[PDB]
mmCIF file of all heavy atoms in Angstrom:
data_model
loop_
_atom_site.group_PDB
_atom_site.id
_atom_site.type_symbol
_atom_site.label_atom_id
_atom_site.label_comp_id
_atom_site.label_asym_id
_atom_site.label_seq_id
_atom_site.Cartn_x
_atom_site.Cartn_y
_atom_site.Cartn_z
ATOM 1 N N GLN A 263 46.248 15.084 20.728
ATOM 2 C CA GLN A 263 46.973 15.992 21.599
ATOM 3 C C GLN A 263 46.462 15.949 23.026
ATOM 4 O O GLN A 263 47.241 15.993 23.987
ATOM 5 C CB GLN A 263 46.899 17.409 21.035
ATOM 6 C CG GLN A 263 47.935 17.725 19.987
ATOM 7 C CD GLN A 263 47.757 19.115 19.396
ATOM 8 O OE1 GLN A 263 47.210 20.009 20.014
ATOM 9 N NE2 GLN A 263 48.215 19.291 18.152
ATOM 10 N N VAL A 264 45.151 15.852 23.197
ATOM 11 C CA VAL A 264 44.515 15.883 24.512
ATOM 12 C C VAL A 264 43.824 14.546 24.827
ATOM 13 O O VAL A 264 42.825 14.505 25.548
ATOM 14 C CB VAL A 264 43.536 17.067 24.651
ATOM 15 C CG1 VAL A 264 44.261 18.385 24.561
ATOM 16 C CG2 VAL A 264 42.439 16.965 23.579
ATOM 17 N N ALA A 265 44.359 13.488 24.235
ATOM 18 C CA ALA A 265 43.813 12.155 24.471
ATOM 19 C C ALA A 265 43.944 11.749 25.934
ATOM 20 O O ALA A 265 44.868 12.218 26.645
ATOM 21 C CB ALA A 265 44.482 11.117 23.561
ATOM 22 N N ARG A 266 43.060 10.886 26.400
ATOM 23 C CA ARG A 266 43.092 10.422 27.749
ATOM 24 C C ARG A 266 44.369 9.676 28.070
ATOM 25 O O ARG A 266 45.054 9.908 29.092
ATOM 26 C CB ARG A 266 41.890 9.516 28.057
ATOM 27 C CG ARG A 266 40.616 10.277 28.437
ATOM 28 C CD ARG A 266 39.512 9.319 28.854
ATOM 29 N NE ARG A 266 38.613 9.876 29.845
ATOM 30 C CZ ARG A 266 38.134 9.210 30.905
ATOM 31 N NH1 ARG A 266 38.455 7.928 31.089
ATOM 32 N NH2 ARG A 266 37.339 9.832 31.726
ATOM 33 N N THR A 267 44.780 8.759 27.159
ATOM 34 C CA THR A 267 46.009 8.007 27.328
ATOM 35 C C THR A 267 46.738 7.952 26.008
ATOM 36 O O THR A 267 46.151 8.111 24.926
ATOM 37 C CB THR A 267 45.715 6.581 27.807
ATOM 38 O OG1 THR A 267 44.804 5.921 26.921
ATOM 39 C CG2 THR A 267 45.119 6.579 29.218
ATOM 40 N N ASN A 268 48.041 7.703 26.082
ATOM 41 C CA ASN A 268 48.849 7.605 24.896
ATOM 42 C C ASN A 268 48.632 6.236 24.226
ATOM 43 O O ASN A 268 47.740 5.460 24.606
ATOM 44 C CB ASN A 268 50.355 7.758 25.260
ATOM 45 C CG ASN A 268 50.675 9.216 25.645
ATOM 46 O OD1 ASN A 268 50.211 10.168 25.069
ATOM 47 N ND2 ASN A 268 51.536 9.331 26.668
ATOM 48 N N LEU A 269 49.405 5.967 23.169
ATOM 49 C CA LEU A 269 49.223 4.737 22.428
ATOM 50 C C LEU A 269 49.557 3.499 23.253
ATOM 51 O O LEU A 269 49.014 2.427 23.038
ATOM 52 C CB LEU A 269 50.104 4.745 21.158
ATOM 53 C CG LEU A 269 49.700 5.762 20.083
ATOM 54 C CD1 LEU A 269 50.746 5.819 18.986
ATOM 55 C CD2 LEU A 269 48.347 5.407 19.503
ATOM 56 N N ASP A 270 50.427 3.657 24.260
ATOM 57 C CA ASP A 270 50.772 2.588 25.171
ATOM 58 C C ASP A 270 49.848 2.465 26.384
ATOM 59 O O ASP A 270 50.000 1.546 27.156
ATOM 60 C CB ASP A 270 52.224 2.721 25.630
ATOM 61 C CG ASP A 270 52.498 4.061 26.272
ATOM 62 O OD1 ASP A 270 51.654 4.968 26.162
ATOM 63 O OD2 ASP A 270 53.579 4.225 26.886
ATOM 64 N N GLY A 271 48.904 3.393 26.501
ATOM 65 C CA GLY A 271 47.968 3.393 27.604
ATOM 66 C C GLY A 271 48.400 4.132 28.858
ATOM 67 O O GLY A 271 47.599 4.305 29.770
ATOM 68 N N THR A 272 49.648 4.595 28.906
ATOM 69 C CA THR A 272 50.147 5.309 30.078
ATOM 70 C C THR A 272 49.597 6.733 30.086
ATOM 71 O O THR A 272 49.271 7.299 29.028
ATOM 72 C CB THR A 272 51.672 5.351 30.096
ATOM 73 O OG1 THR A 272 52.140 6.088 28.960
ATOM 74 C CG2 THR A 272 52.217 3.925 30.022
ATOM 75 N N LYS A 273 49.508 7.305 31.273
ATOM 76 C CA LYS A 273 49.064 8.690 31.415
ATOM 77 C C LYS A 273 50.116 9.659 30.864
ATOM 78 O O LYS A 273 51.288 9.546 31.172
ATOM 79 C CB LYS A 273 48.777 9.032 32.860
ATOM 80 C CG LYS A 273 47.690 8.187 33.497
ATOM 81 C CD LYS A 273 47.437 8.583 34.943
ATOM 82 C CE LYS A 273 46.459 7.583 35.618
ATOM 83 N NZ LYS A 273 45.115 7.627 34.988
ATOM 84 N N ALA A 274 49.680 10.600 30.013
ATOM 85 C CA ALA A 274 50.614 11.530 29.367
ATOM 86 C C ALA A 274 50.930 12.700 30.309
ATOM 87 O O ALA A 274 52.082 12.903 30.685
ATOM 88 C CB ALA A 274 50.001 12.033 28.055
ATOM 89 N N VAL A 275 49.925 13.453 30.718
ATOM 90 C CA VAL A 275 50.107 14.637 31.557
ATOM 91 C C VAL A 275 49.083 14.557 32.715
ATOM 92 O O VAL A 275 48.053 13.887 32.590
ATOM 93 C CB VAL A 275 49.894 15.946 30.745
ATOM 94 C CG1 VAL A 275 50.378 17.171 31.529
ATOM 95 C CG2 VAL A 275 50.596 15.882 29.415
ATOM 96 N N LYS A 276 49.450 15.203 33.819
ATOM 97 C CA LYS A 276 48.533 15.306 34.925
ATOM 98 C C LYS A 276 47.345 16.230 34.554
ATOM 99 O O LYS A 276 47.529 17.247 33.894
ATOM 100 C CB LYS A 276 49.206 15.838 36.172
ATOM 101 C CG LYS A 276 48.452 15.684 37.465
ATOM 102 C CD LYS A 276 49.313 15.866 38.677
ATOM 103 C CE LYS A 276 48.589 15.544 39.962
ATOM 104 N NZ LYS A 276 49.456 15.634 41.136
ATOM 105 N N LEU A 277 46.160 15.830 34.971
ATOM 106 C CA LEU A 277 44.927 16.503 34.550
ATOM 107 C C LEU A 277 44.302 17.237 35.749
ATOM 108 O O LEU A 277 44.340 16.757 36.852
ATOM 109 C CB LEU A 277 43.922 15.492 33.984
ATOM 110 C CG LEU A 277 44.427 14.569 32.855
ATOM 111 C CD1 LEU A 277 43.262 13.963 32.103
ATOM 112 C CD2 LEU A 277 45.336 15.297 31.891
ATOM 113 N N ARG A 278 43.734 18.430 35.440
ATOM 114 C CA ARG A 278 43.108 19.257 36.451
ATOM 115 C C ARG A 278 41.940 19.997 35.749
ATOM 116 O O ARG A 278 41.535 19.633 34.668
ATOM 117 C CB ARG A 278 44.158 20.195 37.057
ATOM 118 C CG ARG A 278 44.939 19.584 38.228
ATOM 119 C CD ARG A 278 45.978 20.573 38.741
ATOM 120 N NE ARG A 278 46.781 20.000 39.833
ATOM 121 C CZ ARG A 278 47.899 19.315 39.674
ATOM 122 N NH1 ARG A 278 48.393 19.112 38.473
ATOM 123 N NH2 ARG A 278 48.534 18.844 40.757
ATOM 124 N N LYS A 279 41.439 21.061 36.425
ATOM 125 C CA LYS A 279 40.153 21.661 36.039
ATOM 126 C C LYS A 279 40.228 22.984 35.338
ATOM 127 O O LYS A 279 39.614 23.160 34.295
ATOM 128 C CB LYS A 279 39.281 21.782 37.285
ATOM 129 C CG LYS A 279 37.774 21.811 36.986
ATOM 130 C CD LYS A 279 36.952 21.565 38.223
ATOM 131 C CE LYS A 279 35.467 21.565 37.892
ATOM 132 N NZ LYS A 279 34.628 21.209 39.104
ATOM 133 N N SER A 280 40.987 23.954 35.846
ATOM 134 C CA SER A 280 40.824 25.340 35.516
ATOM 135 C C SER A 280 42.039 25.888 34.762
ATOM 136 O O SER A 280 42.940 25.124 34.386
ATOM 137 C CB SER A 280 40.574 26.196 36.780
ATOM 138 O OG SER A 280 41.798 26.546 37.378
ATOM 139 N N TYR A 281 42.043 27.172 34.509
ATOM 140 C CA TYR A 281 43.075 27.786 33.640
ATOM 141 C C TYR A 281 44.288 28.301 34.434
ATOM 142 O O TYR A 281 45.204 28.906 33.822
ATOM 143 C CB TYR A 281 42.486 28.965 32.866
ATOM 144 C CG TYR A 281 42.420 30.302 33.580
ATOM 145 C CD1 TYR A 281 43.406 31.271 33.359
ATOM 146 C CD2 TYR A 281 41.399 30.568 34.460
ATOM 147 C CE1 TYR A 281 43.352 32.481 34.034
ATOM 148 C CE2 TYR A 281 41.359 31.805 35.126
ATOM 149 C CZ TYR A 281 42.335 32.722 34.924
ATOM 150 O OH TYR A 281 42.290 33.946 35.582
ATOM 151 N N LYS A 282 44.362 28.022 35.748
ATOM 152 C CA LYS A 282 45.414 28.637 36.589
ATOM 153 C C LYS A 282 46.800 28.262 36.107
ATOM 154 O O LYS A 282 47.686 29.142 36.059
ATOM 155 C CB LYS A 282 45.208 28.247 38.031
ATOM 156 C CG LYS A 282 46.483 28.353 38.867
ATOM 157 C CD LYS A 282 46.234 27.866 40.310
ATOM 158 C CE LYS A 282 47.501 27.894 41.107
ATOM 159 N NZ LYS A 282 47.278 27.503 42.540
ATOM 160 N N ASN A 283 47.048 27.003 35.774
ATOM 161 C CA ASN A 283 48.381 26.584 35.429
ATOM 162 C C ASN A 283 48.861 27.119 34.073
ATOM 163 O O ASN A 283 50.040 27.004 33.776
ATOM 164 C CB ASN A 283 48.473 25.052 35.432
ATOM 165 C CG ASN A 283 48.572 24.481 36.830
ATOM 166 O OD1 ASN A 283 47.636 23.837 37.309
ATOM 167 N ND2 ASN A 283 49.702 24.710 37.464
ATOM 168 N N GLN A 284 47.964 27.749 33.296
ATOM 169 C CA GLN A 284 48.387 28.386 32.063
ATOM 170 C C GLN A 284 49.027 29.761 32.277
ATOM 171 O O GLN A 284 49.535 30.320 31.313
ATOM 172 C CB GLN A 284 47.188 28.548 31.128
ATOM 173 C CG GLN A 284 46.866 27.276 30.308
ATOM 174 C CD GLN A 284 45.429 27.202 29.876
ATOM 175 O OE1 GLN A 284 44.562 27.853 30.453
ATOM 176 N NE2 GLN A 284 45.143 26.355 28.893
ATOM 177 N N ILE A 285 48.995 30.258 33.516
ATOM 178 C CA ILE A 285 49.576 31.546 33.837
ATOM 179 C C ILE A 285 50.755 31.382 34.835
ATOM 180 O O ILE A 285 51.294 32.392 35.278
ATOM 181 C CB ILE A 285 48.540 32.531 34.371
ATOM 182 C CG1 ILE A 285 48.205 32.218 35.842
ATOM 183 C CG2 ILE A 285 47.289 32.473 33.539
ATOM 184 C CD1 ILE A 285 47.243 33.168 36.494
ATOM 185 N N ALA A 286 51.116 30.147 35.189
ATOM 186 C CA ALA A 286 52.172 29.951 36.138
ATOM 187 C C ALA A 286 53.535 30.403 35.623
ATOM 188 O O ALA A 286 54.399 30.818 36.410
ATOM 189 C CB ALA A 286 52.228 28.478 36.555
ATOM 190 N N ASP A 287 53.724 30.339 34.332
ATOM 191 C CA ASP A 287 54.990 30.767 33.748
ATOM 192 C C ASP A 287 55.252 32.260 33.960
ATOM 193 O O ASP A 287 56.369 32.696 34.034
ATOM 194 C CB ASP A 287 55.072 30.399 32.262
ATOM 195 C CG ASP A 287 53.979 31.097 31.464
ATOM 196 O OD1 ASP A 287 52.847 31.269 31.990
ATOM 197 O OD2 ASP A 287 54.229 31.474 30.304
ATOM 198 N N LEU A 288 54.162 33.053 33.999
ATOM 199 C CA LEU A 288 54.291 34.472 34.233
ATOM 200 C C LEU A 288 54.641 34.750 35.680
ATOM 201 O O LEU A 288 54.271 34.016 36.594
ATOM 202 C CB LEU A 288 53.032 35.222 33.831
ATOM 203 C CG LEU A 288 52.579 35.052 32.385
ATOM 204 C CD1 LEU A 288 51.237 35.774 32.140
ATOM 205 C CD2 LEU A 288 53.637 35.573 31.434
ATOM 206 N N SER A 289 55.380 35.865 35.891
ATOM 207 C CA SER A 289 55.768 36.233 37.228
ATOM 208 C C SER A 289 54.565 36.607 38.083
ATOM 209 O O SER A 289 53.614 37.232 37.599
ATOM 210 C CB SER A 289 56.742 37.414 37.203
ATOM 211 O OG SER A 289 57.125 37.821 38.495
ATOM 212 N N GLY A 290 54.578 36.205 39.344
ATOM 213 C CA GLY A 290 53.499 36.487 40.237
ATOM 214 C C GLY A 290 53.158 35.291 41.176
ATOM 215 O O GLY A 290 53.672 34.204 40.962
#
Side-chain angles (χ1 to χ4, degrees):
Chain A
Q263 276 176 25
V264 295
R266 276 186 149 221
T267 56
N268 291 320
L269 292 172
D270 55 349
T272 66
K273 299 182 188 295
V275 192
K276 195 165 186 175
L277 308 197
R278 275 178 182 90
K279 204 164 183 177
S280 83
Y281 85 99
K282 156 183 177 176
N283 282 111
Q284 276 155 342
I285 78 176
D287 61 325
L288 300 178
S289 178

